[PDB]
Point group: none
């Protein structure tokens, strides 16, 4: 269910374009990380996609969420089973 | 179905503090626990589970407008925010 | 509107986070929280319930000094972080007595 490159980019555009609007602006202003609920400086939060871009995931308010480096990273490498033990360890 | 884990999160701590800060994911505004609902970012229909990641606070407007406005009409609600 | 980016190195952030740790242990600080007054809401709390807050955040250039350091209660300390400048004002302006 992988997508093409002119798509994996076709969205990473709607990303930077969303990443630059009131919604995302204030969102990072607050500093609250979606996953662990902790507060961080607006810079230490990343735009993370629930359903990946390379799986048909769109870049919208209904699929993109603020995440800190920490949570956002573990999400990438931890195993789908490990990701839970981590969020459930918080 | 997963409506089990569903009402579960609602009684959890991550969600208590969540609906206490009162931030709606969609419009970024703050509301009272009475105006906030729990919504699944990744619809449950398409096989979305009920877990910290795929569940966010949403005021009635955003929750209903997304759950009822056509694909083209929901996108318009946001552009107006 | 002209604008510029100001950067705060991680060397500077630690530097301030250390002076803070030292400032937090001073007789001077112990005295300040001993009074138990929250700088933001002016409500009274037990010394355990107060934390040190920088009016001007360290990542925004602020320093760890008596002037920029202030005692704050749990609620005020966070709300000052996740509420935008306007929700904060209203939050303050909505404290009775
Ligand atoms: Mg902040
Ligand atoms: Zn996090
Ligand atoms: Zn809303
Ligand atoms: Zn206070």
């Amino acid at each position: 269910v992988e997508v093409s490159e002119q798509e994996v980019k076709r969205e990473k555009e709607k990303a930077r374009e969303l990443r630059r609007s009131q919604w995302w602006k204030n969102r990072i202003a607050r500093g609250i990380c979606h996953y662990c609920g902790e507060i961080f400086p607006p810079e230490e939060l990343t735009m993370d996609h629930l359903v990946p871009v390379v799986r048909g995931g769109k870049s919208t308010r209904g699929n993109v969420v603020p995440a800190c480096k920490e949570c956002n990273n573990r999400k990438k490498y931890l195993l789908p089973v490990e990701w839970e033990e981590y969020l459930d360890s918080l």
